[PDB]
Design a protein around this ligand. Structure first.
Ligand code: NA
Ligand code: NA
Ligand code: NA
Ligand code: NA
Lengths: 276, 4, 100
């Protein structure tokens, strides 16, 4: 199966009120396993999954050092960006970044990522070919020239091709009892009258992992797009996810409606009906 | 990165 | 410069059963910037011991957080989530529905 190691970061300036806030997190697939939050007294990179707790003191010291170096650099970048865009000294601004590697089914680098945003807008991204940059505007073009001068794309690619994958492999092994398990959705359909001639069927998918899922309603085998509401997949808070979709139907015609669920944990797509 |  | 208004959902971790301990969640998502205030309410009063997830974000760079706390549903108690954000003129409150 395919897997990913990803780090995400948010840096928020607080002009006049001290240092920016830095919150960084790391994920393997859809599971968070580390964090760094600068607004602690002595901030440390910390475990947020059980299977990473076994890493020794040198691991946590090195990751705390990397977090602090990144924060120093994010701080510099927030200042630089304020200048690039000729913005006031007074407003708060946000820098976000993400980076990581995908391990393919053949055990090799499938994809690499390195992307940044300023105040919620795409700023600069590493090209899918991992050789060059794509800049969103003239400010990012300045960054691009600097990163080209220091051959940063090649240096980051070396991280992606080596250590990123080495660490991902290690996490996947150490955490294999949870990371490498596809938990299927528990599914059910509820029924709630809307009027004396209509009812709502709500199709539930609960407790599934990973997050990727599809859930649709059909009437007589036909995809339903009217009289319907779907919620986006959302975390349950126990490491699993939830999703539901509801459709309003004519009373007495419930059995014409079918809910269709597909997930890695389901060997076949599920077809479900209300069961009175 | 190494500085934006 | 783009600001995005939070989506707000209140729901339980597991299917609710009266008398059965559970977790009450408020999931706020799709917002920007990141500063946000979230309370879980029990019969209109702010619940204590509310924890939340570490700040993260989606592919469009919008933020999400999960707020959660222990609770045991029963016939009498009403729950809600109340949210403040720069995009909102005043707090926005969403009531818990036992089938949403
Ligand atoms: Na898999
Ligand atoms: Na699992
Ligand atoms: Na499947
Ligand atoms: Na507000």
């Amino acid at each position: 199966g395919s897997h990913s190691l990803r780090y995400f970061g948010t840096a928020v300036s607080r002009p006049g009120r001290g240092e920016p806030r830095f919150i960084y997190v790391g994920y393997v697939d859809d599971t968070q396993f580390v964090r760094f939050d600068s607004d602690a007294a002595s901030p440390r990179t910390e475990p947020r999954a059980p299977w990473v707790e076994q890493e020794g003191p040198e691991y946590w010291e090195e990751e705390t050092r990397r977090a602090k170096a990144r924060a120093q650099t994010d701080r510099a970048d927030l200042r630089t960006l304020r200048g690039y865009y000729n913005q006031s000294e007074a407003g708060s601004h946000t820098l976000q970044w993400m980076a990581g590697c995908d391990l393919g089914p053949n055990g090799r680098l499938l994809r690499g990522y390195h992307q940044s945003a300023y105040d919620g807008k795409d700023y600069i991204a590493l090209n899918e070919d991992l050789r060059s940059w794509i800049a969103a505007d003239m400010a990012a073009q300045n960054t691009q020239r600097k990163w080209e001068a220091t051959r940063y794309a090649e240096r980051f690619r070396a991280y992606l091709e080596g250590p990123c994958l080495e660490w991902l492999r290690r996490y996947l092994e150490n955490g294999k009892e949870t990371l490498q398990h596809a938990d299927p959705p528990k599914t059910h359909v509820t029924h709630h009258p809307v009027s004396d001639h209509e009812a709502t069927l709500r199709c539930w998918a609960l407790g599934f992992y990973p997050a990727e899922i599809t859930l649709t309603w059909q009437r007589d085998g036909e995809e339903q797009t009217q009289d319907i509401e779907f919620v986006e997949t959302r975390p349950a808070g126990d490491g699993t996810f939830q999703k539901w979709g509801a459709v309003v139907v004519p009373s007495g015609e419930e059995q014409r409606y079918t809910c269709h669920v597909q997930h890695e944990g389901l060997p076949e797509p599920l077809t479900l009906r209300w069961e009175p | 990165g190494g500085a934006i | 410069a783009i600001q995005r208004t939070p989506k707000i959902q209140v729901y339980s971790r597991h299917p609710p059963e009266n008398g059965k301990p559970n977790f009450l969640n408020c999931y706020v998502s799709g917002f920007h910037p990141s500063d946000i205030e979230v309370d879980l309410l029990k019969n209109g009063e702010k619940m204590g011991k509310v924890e939340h997830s570490d700040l993260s974000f989606s592919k469009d760079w919008s933020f999400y957080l999960l707020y959660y706390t222990e609770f045991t549903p029963n016939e009498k108690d009403e729950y809600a989530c109340r949210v403040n954000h720069v995009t909102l003129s005043g707090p926005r409150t969403v009531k818990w529905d036992r089938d949403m």
